[PDB]
Every structure is written in C-alpha cells, then in structure tokens.
Amino acid sequence: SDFDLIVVGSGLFGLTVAERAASQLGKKVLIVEKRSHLGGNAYSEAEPETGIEIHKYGAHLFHTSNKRVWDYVNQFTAFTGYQHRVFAMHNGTAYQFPMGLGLINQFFGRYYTPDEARELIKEQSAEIDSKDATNLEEKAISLIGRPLYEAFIRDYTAKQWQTDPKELPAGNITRLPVRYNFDNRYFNDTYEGLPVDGYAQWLSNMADHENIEVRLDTDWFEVREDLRAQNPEAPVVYTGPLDRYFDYSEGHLGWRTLDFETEVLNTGDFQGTPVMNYNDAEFPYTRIHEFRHFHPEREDRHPKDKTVIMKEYSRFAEEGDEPYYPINTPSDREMLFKYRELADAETESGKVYFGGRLGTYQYLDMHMAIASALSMFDNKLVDALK
Amino acid sequence: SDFDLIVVGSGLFGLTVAERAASQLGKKVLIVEKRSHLGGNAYSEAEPETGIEIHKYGAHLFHTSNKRVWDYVNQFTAFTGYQHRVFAMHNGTAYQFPMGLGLINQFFGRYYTPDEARELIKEQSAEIDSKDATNLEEKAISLIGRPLYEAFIRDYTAKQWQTDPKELPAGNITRLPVRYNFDNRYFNDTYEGLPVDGYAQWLSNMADHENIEVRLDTDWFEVREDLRAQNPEAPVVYTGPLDRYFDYSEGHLGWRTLDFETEVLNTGDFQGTPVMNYNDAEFPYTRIHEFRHFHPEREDRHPKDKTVIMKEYSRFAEEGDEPYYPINTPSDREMLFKYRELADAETESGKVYFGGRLGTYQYLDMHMAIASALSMFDNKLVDALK
Ligand SMILES: Cc1cc2c(cc1C)N(C[C@H](O)[C@H](O)[C@H](O)COP(=O)(O)OP(=O)(O)OC[C@H]1O[C@@H](n3cnc4c(N)ncnc43)[C@H](O)[C@@H]1O)c1[nH]c(=O)[nH]c(=O)c1N2
Ligand SMILES: Cc1cc2c(cc1C)N(C[C@H](O)[C@H](O)[C@H](O)COP(=O)(O)OP(=O)(O)OC[C@H]1O[C@@H](n3cnc4c(N)ncnc43)[C@H](O)[C@@H]1O)c1[nH]c(=O)[nH]c(=O)c1N2
Ligand SMILES: CC(=O)N[C@H]1[C@@H](OP(=O)(O)OP(=O)(O)OC[C@H]2O[C@@H](n3ccc(=O)[nH]c3=O)[C@H](O)[C@@H]2O)O[C@H](CO)[C@@H](O)[C@@H]1O
Ligand SMILES: CC(=O)N[C@H]1[C@@H](OP(=O)(O)OP(=O)(O)OC[C@H]2O[C@@H](n3ccc(=O)[nH]c3=O)[C@H](O)[C@@H]2O)O[C@H](CO)[C@@H](O)[C@@H]1O
Ligand code: NA
Ligand code: NA
Known part of the structure; x- marks a missing residue:
C-alpha cells in the first residue's frame, strides 16, 4: 500500500503516533492536516517585522517530570535552560x-x-x-x-x-x-526548557521521516472516503474535534x-x-x-x-x-460520556482511534499529550498494524 | 624515583597540577598538605548534628564561562542545576x-x-x-x-x-x-552548579589516581630538605603563602x-x-x-x-x-613586586614554581584558579618534567 496508517491532525498527539509508527514499526504513515502549518496548537512562527519567535495559539512552556517523555522529545530537538x-x-x-x-x-x-x-x-x-x-x-x-x-x-x-x-x-x-x-x-517539574530552534523546527523534525507523508490544507471529512478506499484496512488515528466527528449529533461541546x-x-x-x-x-x-x-x-x-x-x-x-x-459544565460532561461510547463503537467497527486534546475533550500539557500518544501507540496501535 | 613532582598544598591549584601531571605525563606526584583535610579553602564537611553540608572557609558557588575548565571539572564530579x-x-x-x-x-x-x-x-x-x-x-x-x-x-x-x-x-x-x-x-556565566556529592567528594576524586600520593598534616617547611634530598631534580609547585616562603624578609602581606x-x-x-x-x-x-x-x-x-x-x-x-x-594597599602591592622577583629567581635556581591564591597574593575564583593551574601545566611544567 501507499500508506499503512492515517493520522488526522499534526499536533503533538498526531505527530507522536506518526513518528512511532514510522520508526518503530516501519509502516508508511499519511498525516492529514486541516491548517497550512504543521504542528497543531504548539506551532510558532517568526513575527515578520522583528524576526522574534511567537507562539500564535498561546504561550507554550515545556516542562515534565516524566523521564520517558523527556528522553523521547530530545531525539527531535534540544532544549534551552530556560526556567x-x-x-x-x-x-x-x-x-x-x-x-x-x-x-x-x-x-x-x-x-x-x-x-x-x-x-x-x-x-x-x-x-x-x-x-x-x-x-x-x-x-x-x-x-x-x-x-x-x-x-x-x-x-x-x-x-x-x-x-x-x-x-x-x-x-x-x-x-x-x-x-x-x-x-x-x-513550575516544580524535573525537566524544563524551550526548543532551541523554536517549536516549528521541532515539530517539523518529528514528521521528517522517509515513511511519513504530510498533506497540509486538507480536511479529513472532505477526503476520508477517497483515502480509506485506497486501503480499507489502514487504521485511522483521529485527533480532531470529538463532537464534529459525529456531526454534533449529541449537542455542541462547550x-x-x-x-x-x-x-x-x-x-x-x-x-x-x-x-x-x-x-x-x-x-x-x-x-x-x-x-x-x-x-x-x-x-x-x-x-x-x-x-x-x-x-x-x-x-x-x-x-x-x-x-x-x-x-x-456538568451538562458538558454529560454529552461527553455519550460521545465516548460513540467513539468506542466507531473504533470497533471502523478501526478509527480517538486521541489528543480535541478528540477526547481534555486539556493536555504537551508532555501529557505526548505520553498519551505513546500509551495509545504501545497499548492499542502495535496490535492494530500486524 | 618514588616521586617526580612535589606539590605543596591540596587546593584547586595544587590538585589541578597534580592530576594533570599524573594522568597526562604519567609522572609520580607527591602532594604535601599542612591541614588535616584535602581540598584547600574549597573544602566542605557535614555538620555533625544535622548532616547538612557546609563550606567552612566561606560559601563556594561554582560558575564559569570557560568551556575548557567546565569540561575538565566534569571529569571529577557532576554538578546540579543550582542557580x-x-x-x-x-x-x-x-x-x-x-x-x-x-x-x-x-x-x-x-x-x-x-x-x-x-x-x-x-x-x-x-x-x-x-x-x-x-x-x-x-x-x-x-x-x-x-x-x-x-x-x-x-x-x-x-x-x-x-x-x-x-x-x-x-x-x-x-x-x-x-x-x-x-x-x-x-551570576552571568554560561555554566553554573554545585558538585552533586559535595566539594570534599569532588576534590578527593581529583587526587584519586594511582600516581598520586597525599600526605595530610605535613608542613612543607618541616619536610622540604628531607624530601628534595630523595630526588633533587624533582620540581616543586608551591601554593602556600608567598611571603612566608621567604620568611617575611620583605614585610608581611596584608x-x-x-x-x-x-x-x-x-x-x-x-x-x-x-x-x-x-x-x-x-x-x-x-x-x-x-x-x-x-x-x-x-x-x-x-x-x-x-x-x-x-x-x-x-x-x-x-x-x-x-x-x-x-x-x-599600594604599600602592599609594593612588597609584592619585590617578592615576585624573589620567586622568579628561586624558580630558576631551585625548580620551585609559585601558583595559586596564596602563592601569588591574588584572589581567584575556583574556575580562575583551575585555569591558572592548567596554564602553568601546559606552559611551564610539561618542559620541566622531560
Ligand atoms: C492557550 C494554551 C496554552 C498552552 C497549551 C494549550 C493551550 C490551549 N499547551 C497545551 C498544548 O497546546 C497541547 O498539549 C497540544 O496542543 C496537544 O496536541 P494535540 O495533538 O492533542 O492537539 P492540537 O490541537 O495541537 O492538534 C490537532 C491538530 O489537528 C488538526 N485538525 C483538526 N481537525 C481536523 C480535521 N478535520 N482534519 C484535519 N486536521 C484537523 C488541527 O488543525 C491541529 O493541527 C501547553 N502545554 C504545556 O505543556 N505547556 C504550555 O505552556 C502550554 N501552553
Ligand atoms: C571567602 C571566600 C569565598 C569563596 C572563595 C574564596 C574565599 C576567600 N572562592 C575561591 C576559592 O576559595 C579559591 O578559588 C581556591 O581556594 C583557590 O585554590 P588554591 O589552590 O589556589 O588555594 P587554597 O587556599 O584553596 O589551597 C592552598 C592549600 O595549601 C595548603 N598549605 C598552605 N601552606 C602550606 C604549607 N606550608 N605546607 C603545606 N600545605 C600548605 C593550605 O592548607 C591549603 O590546603 C570562591 N570561588 C568561586 O569561584 N566561587 C565562590 O563562590 C567562592 N567562594
Ligand atoms: C486551572 C487550569 O486550567 N490551569 C491551567 C493553566 O495554568 P497557568 O499556569 O497558565 O495559569 P492561569 O493563569 O491559567 O491560572 C489558573 C487559575 O489559577 C488562578 N490564578 C492564576 C494566576 C494568577 O495570577 N491568579 C490566580 O488567581 C485562577 O483561578 C486561574 O483560573 O494553563 C496551564 C498551561 O496552559 C495548564 O497546565 C493548567 O492546567
Ligand atoms: C570586590 C570583590 O572582591 N568581590 C568578590 C566577592 O563578590 P560577592 O558576590 O561575594 O559579593 P560581596 O558581598 O563581597 O560584594 C562585593 C562588593 O560589592 C558591594 N556590594 C555587594 C553586595 C551588597 O549587598 N552591597 C554592596 O554594596 C560592596 O562594595 C562589596 O564590597 O566575592 C566573590 C566570591 O568570593 C568574588 O568573585 C568577587 O571578586
Ligand atoms: Na481556613
Ligand atoms: Na552621574
């Protein structure tokens, strides 16, 4: 096949699953991103007048006490001693x-x-x-x-x-x-810094692998039927909004x-x-x-x-x-539970896995997202690709 | 011979010269220390009641921008991230x-x-x-x-x-x-920390070499004539007080x-x-x-x-x-100049080199002392031991 795994979204969750599938299982991975930029909400670009790096989805400070996560991310970037x-x-x-x-x-x-x-x-x-x-x-x-x-x-x-x-x-x-x-x-965590060449460079380094293909400016919902048709037994890791997946059929998450x-x-x-x-x-x-x-x-x-x-x-x-x-809102945690059982079913009938900030309606620090992705890789995805 | 080099004093200056002579030139080095402790004014010991490490010749904070010094000292100890x-x-x-x-x-x-x-x-x-x-x-x-x-x-x-x-x-x-x-x-320096197992452990690691002998509780001036008699052509690195060497014959440094x-x-x-x-x-x-x-x-x-x-x-x-x-006092910088020419002569007739905080009447940060010792090693001592 041209690809073995489809990953929707190129934030830390998506990228981590992608990189692990590419480098550990040797599988071909296609990443589909709605935006024009790689990296999801962690992305940074230089302000054009001054050249100063800014994070345009909020300031991102990297900190963790999770040695596994720390060792992992240092494969793709060095960090500064910033506290x-x-x-x-x-x-x-x-x-x-x-x-x-x-x-x-x-x-x-x-x-x-x-x-x-x-x-x-x-x-x-x-x-x-x-x-x-x-x-x-x-x-x-x-x-x-x-x-x-x-x-x-x-x-x-x-x-x-x-x-x-x-x-x-x-x-x-x-x-x-x-x-x-x-x-x-x-922060009280063991390890802390900022990516030396900025976030964009780091995230982009994660997708730099011979087995990974990235299509920027591509909404999954416009191309899903086409792509899954090219290889019906390729699994999907969806990191988009959980409710929008199921056409807000249980109400809009707040x-x-x-x-x-x-x-x-x-x-x-x-x-x-x-x-x-x-x-x-x-x-x-x-x-x-x-x-x-x-x-x-x-x-x-x-x-x-x-x-x-x-x-x-x-x-x-x-x-x-x-x-x-x-x-x-507890009214919010309500339509969540119903969506989790929609997802579980969808996972079992369609080989479509739900992860990440948007896909699980959860706030995640960067290291938490990376750890959650590494978890899903080892526990669910290794089996799914055999 | 039983030794090839005599080093008076076991502070950072002495220890650096010793370790370099031992590990780079393979020479036998005898270190003579007046005190009962190894390490000179950098030394630390545990307070007996609480077990807390204290520095008993002033608080010592290690900081440098000198990469060579930094790489060197990390051979003998790791540092914490203390700022x-x-x-x-x-x-x-x-x-x-x-x-x-x-x-x-x-x-x-x-x-x-x-x-x-x-x-x-x-x-x-x-x-x-x-x-x-x-x-x-x-x-x-x-x-x-x-x-x-x-x-x-x-x-x-x-x-x-x-x-x-x-x-x-x-x-x-x-x-x-x-x-x-x-x-x-x-501090504005590139590298900064405290020795992870304390100072004593670090200094002691510097003298831990098969070619280095240490005699604690030994005044050079009580044993110099005996020791130089065992090998007359072994050079001496003196890091004791400069004036006391020449019996305060030019007045007491202040x-x-x-x-x-x-x-x-x-x-x-x-x-x-x-x-x-x-x-x-x-x-x-x-x-x-x-x-x-x-x-x-x-x-x-x-x-x-x-x-x-x-x-x-x-x-x-x-x-x-x-x-x-x-x-x-400028009266002090006066009797200094005269002592420097005493030392130079003494160096040329007796193979006795003067270094370190006390031996040169100079204040030295730790990294400065180490750099000064590495300098004297490469520029004066390598020739002196051939
Ligand atoms: C304001 C603010 C500030 C911070 C933080 C968050 C927020 C909200 N973060 C957390 C950080 O943003 C978070 O860990 C990551 O965004 C999680 O990455 P995800 O992959 O889970 O989602 P993320 O949102 O990053 O990625 C999802 C990707 O999927 C794409 N996508 C969505 N729908 C799609 C579709 N239909 N088709 C295709 N692509 C689609 C999106 O465009 C996006 O690129 C943080 N953490 C931390 O540790 N320290 C910090 O200092 C901060 N700072
Ligand atoms: C109060 C205070 C505080 C600090 C510092 C200094 C001072 C005064 N230091 C500097 C540090 O103490 C200095 O760099 C080292 O002591 C220099 O090591 P030396 O080998 O030159 O002399 P040092 O004094 O350490 O060693 C000389 C040794 O020779 C011995 N000796 C003398 N006469 C003898 C004789 N006749 N026979 C035998 N042995 C004899 C002495 O007993 C001693 O062990 C510092 N630096 C820094 O970078 N950061 C810091 O935070 C500090 N803090
Ligand atoms: C409660 C919450 O979701 N906190 C998140 C917030 O923390 P972050 O460190 O960004 O701190 P915030 O400014 O969001 O403070 C969180 C809460 O602390 C209180 N506060 C904070 C600062 C202050 O000056 N005064 C004050 O009262 C407020 O109730 C505020 O709602 O963003 C981080 C990074 O995106 C996340 O890791 C945290 O999980
Ligand atoms: C001038 C001098 O020899 N400075 C030494 C001193 O600096 P250190 O960092 O220990 O600072 P000090 O407390 O000795 O201050 C040095 C001078 O700065 C001024 N001051 C400092 C602090 C303060 O609160 N108020 C104030 O006025 C005073 O004039 C003082 O004499 O010890 C360091 C470590 O042993 C050495 O590296 C420095 O070379
Ligand atoms: Na109370
Ligand atoms: Na002025």
Missing part, C-alpha cells in the same frame, strides 16, 4: 509570584520568616474552614484569607472565566497556593477561547520579563507576553529597539472561534 | 537583588518599565558626574544616586572593609550595578579575614533562601548563609525541624587568622 518565572501586577506594583515569602513581604509591608508566614496565613484564613466552603471565593478565602484572595485571585479568576467566583465550584482549588520560601520557579492582541512596540524592552499577569479589573486582558524574553540566548538576532508583545483575552467560544480550554 | 540568587535585607524588608526592576519597584514604591527605570537612574545619579569622583561614596552616588547608594551600598561596604567609603578608592566601582529587567540570576559564627537552629527553615545579605549597620554580620538551601535536591536526607545557619563577619587579619581576600 519560567511570572510576576503579578496589582495597584501599579509588580509582585513576585506565585505566593511565597517574596509576595508576602511586598504586600504586607515587611519580611516574614518561613515560620512567621505559616502563622500569618493561619490567621488570615481561619475566617472560613475549608470543609464548609460552597463556592470558589469561599474556598480560596478559606485557604489564604480575604486580603490575598481579593488582591490576587478575585479579578484574575473573574476575567479568565467571565464569572463571579461566588458562582464558581469550590472543587476548583485543591491545594494551598502558597510557598513558605523565596523560590519563585513557576469551550473557552482566547483572543490574542499582538503589537510591535518601538522599544527594545517593554516589561523586562517574559510574562506579566494583570490581576486588576481595570485591565481587559489576563496577561501580557513579551516573546523576546523567552529566548534571551538570541539577543543578538533580535531588534535593538523593537519588541513584540501580545495581550491575552479570555471568553467563551462561538463557532468559528478556536477551542482552547474545555469548560466542563 | 544562585541573593536577597538584600534593609529596614525589615527582603529586597530582590541585585539592583534591577525588582528592587526598584520595592524601594521607590511602584513599578517602573525598563525605559522608565533608565530615566529614574539618570536623574538620581546626575548629582555627580562620574569622571569627577574622588572616593568610593562619590563614585557610587555618581552611578546610582544617593538614595540607592545609602540604602544598599554604604553600610554593607563599610562592614566588609571596616572603613568609611569616603576613605575608599574611586576605582573600586567600574561598571553600572543595575539591570533594567527582572532577571535576578546572581589580608582581610573572615569569622564564621555557625549555629544549629530548631526549625526546618530559617529564611527560605540560601543567602540573605544584611545591608544595615544595626547588624554586625554582612550576611547569613543557610546551607540546606544550597542543595534542595536532598530535602529527604535533611532534618525536618533543624537547620544549620552561619553568619559571616569581616575584618583584618592578625597572624594566626586565615588569609581570605588580598587587601592591596
């Missing part, structure tokens, strides 16, 4: 973030020792006992007290979800969001979406940090990304007096809008 | 440090953009033009203005050197000590020294950070080290409710006191 750090803008002051001795000092007026800060939090937060909390405002106040909650969580949360926290589920905060030290590494306002400013440095969170209602956006700071090892390939920034706005998805974060 | 960060304690508040947008925000009341902060510094510092500065207070004020200088440099400098900055040389500040971003990595007050506290976390600078006169010490934070990858080999800390005090050296930092 993510975030600052939080509130009443005209940039606060160290997340909440630790750093933020505590700045906010409450003076230095607190680690022990002094445990006690400070104990008092602030005793207003509400945690097991007796009904909504999100309460749950949070119950863990860190009102002053911190109202300055750093309330407006920020309300912007991300377009809703008063009192109207939000208590189960959304699960651990204490405070560190009793000055460690402001944003997504939160993001609008990205991208400007080129005539300064070399707009905020001297990669990401600045804005925690006050006065500002429409949740945060501002300044992409040159994601790659400071490039400062002599970057414009001296220009910089690209990008403000992030949050809201709900009308159709046409990109799906980003699953909403998970 | 050094420092905070500065002033009027009961822990300030982000060194001076950047972080400290500027906290000190002046609100956030300044990178451009806004260049302008802020331009105004504060225009009180004095830099070329017209006479002492250290002026030079500093000339670069960052009085408010910053008086809050973060004056008392701190005065403690380190026991002297009013107005009585200190203007040439001691050479670049602008401010960053116009939020990057608070303390050193600054350090006293180290080490306590074991009954808490698991005293300040939630490795190093806290104290910038106010109210406090005798320049800073407090809390050693568990140097190695957080060990948190499950560390006491849960005990921690070792160590306050650092500065002053001048009486004899008996350890030499740490060269003072360099």
Whole structure:
C-alpha cells in the first residue's frame, strides 16, 4: 500500500503516533492536516517585522517530570535552560509570584520568616474552614484569607472565566497556593526548557521521516472516503474535534477561547520579563507576553529597539472561534460520556482511534499529550498494524 | 624515583597540577598538605548534628564561562542545576537583588518599565558626574544616586572593609550595578552548579589516581630538605603563602579575614533562601548563609525541624587568622613586586614554581584558579618534567 496508517491532525498527539509508527514499526504513515502549518496548537512562527519567535495559539512552556517523555522529545530537538518565572501586577506594583515569602513581604509591608508566614496565613484564613466552603471565593478565602484572595485571585479568576467566583465550584482549588520560601520557579517539574530552534523546527523534525507523508490544507471529512478506499484496512488515528466527528449529533461541546492582541512596540524592552499577569479589573486582558524574553540566548538576532508583545483575552467560544480550554459544565460532561461510547463503537467497527486534546475533550500539557500518544501507540496501535 | 613532582598544598591549584601531571605525563606526584583535610579553602564537611553540608572557609558557588575548565571539572564530579540568587535585607524588608526592576519597584514604591527605570537612574545619579569622583561614596552616588547608594551600598561596604567609603578608592566601582529587567540570576556565566556529592567528594576524586600520593598534616617547611634530598631534580609547585616562603624578609602581606559564627537552629527553615545579605549597620554580620538551601535536591536526607545557619563577619587579619581576600594597599602591592622577583629567581635556581591564591597574593575564583593551574601545566611544567 501507499500508506499503512492515517493520522488526522499534526499536533503533538498526531505527530507522536506518526513518528512511532514510522520508526518503530516501519509502516508508511499519511498525516492529514486541516491548517497550512504543521504542528497543531504548539506551532510558532517568526513575527515578520522583528524576526522574534511567537507562539500564535498561546504561550507554550515545556516542562515534565516524566523521564520517558523527556528522553523521547530530545531525539527531535534540544532544549534551552530556560526556567519560567511570572510576576503579578496589582495597584501599579509588580509582585513576585506565585505566593511565597517574596509576595508576602511586598504586600504586607515587611519580611516574614518561613515560620512567621505559616502563622500569618493561619490567621488570615481561619475566617472560613475549608470543609464548609460552597463556592470558589469561599474556598480560596478559606485557604489564604480575604486580603490575598481579593488582591490576587478575585479579578484574575473573574476575567479568565467571565464569572463571579461566588458562582464558581469550590472543587476548583485543591491545594494551598502558597510557598513558605523565596523560590519563585513557576513550575516544580524535573525537566524544563524551550526548543532551541523554536517549536516549528521541532515539530517539523518529528514528521521528517522517509515513511511519513504530510498533506497540509486538507480536511479529513472532505477526503476520508477517497483515502480509506485506497486501503480499507489502514487504521485511522483521529485527533480532531470529538463532537464534529459525529456531526454534533449529541449537542455542541462547550469551550473557552482566547483572543490574542499582538503589537510591535518601538522599544527594545517593554516589561523586562517574559510574562506579566494583570490581576486588576481595570485591565481587559489576563496577561501580557513579551516573546523576546523567552529566548534571551538570541539577543543578538533580535531588534535593538523593537519588541513584540501580545495581550491575552479570555471568553467563551462561538463557532468559528478556536477551542482552547474545555469548560466542563456538568451538562458538558454529560454529552461527553455519550460521545465516548460513540467513539468506542466507531473504533470497533471502523478501526478509527480517538486521541489528543480535541478528540477526547481534555486539556493536555504537551508532555501529557505526548505520553498519551505513546500509551495509545504501545497499548492499542502495535496490535492494530500486524 | 618514588616521586617526580612535589606539590605543596591540596587546593584547586595544587590538585589541578597534580592530576594533570599524573594522568597526562604519567609522572609520580607527591602532594604535601599542612591541614588535616584535602581540598584547600574549597573544602566542605557535614555538620555533625544535622548532616547538612557546609563550606567552612566561606560559601563556594561554582560558575564559569570557560568551556575548557567546565569540561575538565566534569571529569571529577557532576554538578546540579543550582542557580544562585541573593536577597538584600534593609529596614525589615527582603529586597530582590541585585539592583534591577525588582528592587526598584520595592524601594521607590511602584513599578517602573525598563525605559522608565533608565530615566529614574539618570536623574538620581546626575548629582555627580562620574569622571569627577574622588572616593568610593562619590563614585557610587555618581552611578546610582544617593538614595540607592545609602540604602544598599554604604553600610554593607563599610562592614566588609571596616572603613568609611569616603576613605575608599574611586576605582573600586567600574561598571553600572543595575539591570533594567527582572532577571535576578546572581551570576552571568554560561555554566553554573554545585558538585552533586559535595566539594570534599569532588576534590578527593581529583587526587584519586594511582600516581598520586597525599600526605595530610605535613608542613612543607618541616619536610622540604628531607624530601628534595630523595630526588633533587624533582620540581616543586608551591601554593602556600608567598611571603612566608621567604620568611617575611620583605614585610608581611596584608589580608582581610573572615569569622564564621555557625549555629544549629530548631526549625526546618530559617529564611527560605540560601543567602540573605544584611545591608544595615544595626547588624554586625554582612550576611547569613543557610546551607540546606544550597542543595534542595536532598530535602529527604535533611532534618525536618533543624537547620544549620552561619553568619559571616569581616575584618583584618592578625597572624594566626586565615588569609581570605588580598587587601592591596599600594604599600602592599609594593612588597609584592619585590617578592615576585624573589620567586622568579628561586624558580630558576631551585625548580620551585609559585601558583595559586596564596602563592601569588591574588584572589581567584575556583574556575580562575583551575585555569591558572592548567596554564602553568601546559606552559611551564610539561618542559620541566622531560
Ligand atoms: C492557550 C494554551 C496554552 C498552552 C497549551 C494549550 C493551550 C490551549 N499547551 C497545551 C498544548 O497546546 C497541547 O498539549 C497540544 O496542543 C496537544 O496536541 P494535540 O495533538 O492533542 O492537539 P492540537 O490541537 O495541537 O492538534 C490537532 C491538530 O489537528 C488538526 N485538525 C483538526 N481537525 C481536523 C480535521 N478535520 N482534519 C484535519 N486536521 C484537523 C488541527 O488543525 C491541529 O493541527 C501547553 N502545554 C504545556 O505543556 N505547556 C504550555 O505552556 C502550554 N501552553
Ligand atoms: C571567602 C571566600 C569565598 C569563596 C572563595 C574564596 C574565599 C576567600 N572562592 C575561591 C576559592 O576559595 C579559591 O578559588 C581556591 O581556594 C583557590 O585554590 P588554591 O589552590 O589556589 O588555594 P587554597 O587556599 O584553596 O589551597 C592552598 C592549600 O595549601 C595548603 N598549605 C598552605 N601552606 C602550606 C604549607 N606550608 N605546607 C603545606 N600545605 C600548605 C593550605 O592548607 C591549603 O590546603 C570562591 N570561588 C568561586 O569561584 N566561587 C565562590 O563562590 C567562592 N567562594
Ligand atoms: C486551572 C487550569 O486550567 N490551569 C491551567 C493553566 O495554568 P497557568 O499556569 O497558565 O495559569 P492561569 O493563569 O491559567 O491560572 C489558573 C487559575 O489559577 C488562578 N490564578 C492564576 C494566576 C494568577 O495570577 N491568579 C490566580 O488567581 C485562577 O483561578 C486561574 O483560573 O494553563 C496551564 C498551561 O496552559 C495548564 O497546565 C493548567 O492546567
Ligand atoms: C570586590 C570583590 O572582591 N568581590 C568578590 C566577592 O563578590 P560577592 O558576590 O561575594 O559579593 P560581596 O558581598 O563581597 O560584594 C562585593 C562588593 O560589592 C558591594 N556590594 C555587594 C553586595 C551588597 O549587598 N552591597 C554592596 O554594596 C560592596 O562594595 C562589596 O564590597 O566575592 C566573590 C566570591 O568570593 C568574588 O568573585 C568577587 O571578586
Ligand atoms: Na481556613
Ligand atoms: Na552621574
């Protein structure tokens, strides 16, 4: 045959399945991508004026504690030593973030020792006992007290979800969001970096294999009947939207979406940090990304007096809008379960496997998506191709 | 012969010369060390109560941009991903440090953009033009203005050197000590970490070679005549004090020294950070080290409710006191030049080479000492052993 496996979508999930089928099983793999770009939502391109790499489906920071995933991805790209750090803008002051001795000092007026800060939090937060909390405002106040909650969580949360926290589920905060030290590494994982030649280069390296064919600008649903006819017993890994597959015959799954306002400013440095969170209602956006700071090892390939920034706005998805974060109304988790049994059946009668962010209505970190793909490869696909 | 080379001192300089002679030239090397420990001032041992590694001749942070040095030392030890960060304690508040947008925000009341902060510094510092500065207070004020200088440099400098900055040389500040971003990595070098199994283990690995013999608790000056008699044409690399070699016959070289007050506290976390600078006169010490934070990858080999800390005090050296930092009175740089010509002669008539921190009256970072030793090996010693 001309191909042995069809993969719909060229994000990390698709690409991982493809590469494994190509290099481990030696099978011919055809990848079908709707967009014009390879790589799915992880994709990055250079802003044309300045040459600075930007991620146009949200900022992507790579971090994992999963050694298997880590060793795997280093086959296709090297990573930088970048460590993510975030600052939080509130009443005209940039606060160290997340909440630790750093933020505590700045906010409450003076230095607190680690022990002094445990006690400070104990008092602030005793207003509400945690097991007796009904909504999100309460749950949070119950863990860190009102002053911190109202300055750093309330407006920020309300912007991300377009809703008063009192109207939000208590189960959304699960651990204490405070560190009793000055460690402001944003992520606690073992391995962390950015792809040295950018994301596009990395994703593209995954598809660079003699056994892999890629057709950009191709909707699966326009070509599926043609292609499966060329080899009826070739299996399909579908990573597109789960509901759209079954023609929304159980109702539309509900997504939160993001609008990205991208400007080129005539300064070399707009905020001297990669990401600045804005925690006050006065500002429409949740945060501002300044992409040159994601790659400071490039400062002599970057414009001296220009910089690209990008403000992030949050809201709900009308159709046409990109799906980003699953909403998970319980009404949503409902039409999900019914779709999972549609998929399972479809898998058993049509050899069509469902994976990835869109295909399973699940949020996945990159390393999680890659691990999920490696799982499906070993556990379902190796048998399917014998 | 029983040995081909004699090395006095087992610090990084000595050890580097020894290891190179042993492994590259195949020569037998005898190392003579006055102390009971191997490793010189880089040495670390476990505090006995808690098991936490402490460095008992000052905190040692390893950092270099010298790839050759870096590749070399990784032969004897692996390094952690530790990145050094420092905070500065002033009027009961822990300030982000060194001076950047972080400290500027906290000190002046609100956030300044990178451009806004260049302008802020331009105004504060225009009180004095830099070329017209006479002492250290002026030079500093000339670069960052009085408010910053008086809050973060004056008392701190005065403690380190026991002297009013107005009585200190203007040439001691050479670049602008401010960053116009939020990057608070303390060091700007390419490679940085701490030896994974501690310093003792690393230094000891350098001397672990079939061709190297080590005699601890041995003063060179008590055994030199005996040893050189066993093989008169074996060369000597001396890394002891330069003046003491020539019986202070040109006067005593002047050193600054350090006293180290080490306590074991009954808490698991005293300040939630490795190093806290104290910038106010109210406090005798320049800073407090809390050693568990140097190695957080060990948190499950560390006491849960005990921690070792160590306050650092500065002053001048009486004899008996350890030499740490060269003072360099011009009266000092004077008796130096005369000692260099004593050494050169002694090198030519006695095959006795002078290197390292003490032997050259020079301050050396670890990587600088190692590079200086590798230099002397290739350029002077390879010939000397043929
Ligand atoms: C805003 C935001 C920010 C981040 C992140 C997500 C989001 C939403 N990510 C997560 C990351 O985006 C995620 O892990 C990957 O997108 C998952 O890759 P998938 O293959 O599962 O889907 P993905 O969406 O990437 O790929 C699906 C592909 O299928 C294509 N397709 C869809 N329908 C099709 C059809 N009918 N026919 C053909 N092609 C079709 C799409 O065009 C797309 O190329 C992240 N993770 C992390 O670890 N760190 C981070 O910092 C971030 N940042
Ligand atoms: C307070 C402080 C703090 C730091 C540092 C220095 C100081 C003073 N260092 C620098 C580091 O200490 C330095 O690079 C090494 O000590 C240099 O090693 P040497 O071999 O040159 O001398 P070093 O002093 O280490 O070795 C000399 C050896 O010779 C022995 N000796 C002397 N006289 C003798 C005699 N008569 N007979 C026999 N043996 C004799 C001594 O006992 C000693 O073991 C540092 N660097 C860095 O890169 N990062 C850091 O963070 C620090 N921190
Ligand atoms: C809850 C959720 O889906 N979190 C995701 C989010 O985290 P990410 O690190 O991007 O952080 P967010 O800005 O989305 O914060 C998540 C939540 O934390 C709270 N918050 C956060 C920051 C702040 O300044 N103030 C504040 O209150 C809010 O309730 C907010 O809804 O994106 C990551 C990368 O795409 C994902 O790995 C996470 O799973
Ligand atoms: C001038 C000098 O010998 N510096 C050494 C010092 O730097 P190190 O990083 O240890 O910094 P220090 O605390 O010794 O500061 C050096 C000087 O900077 C100024 N200062 C520093 C910190 C602060 O909070 N406020 C302030 O004003 C003072 O004038 C001080 O004398 O030890 C390092 C490691 O042992 C050496 O690599 C450096 O060469
Ligand atoms: Na509580
Ligand atoms: Na000036």
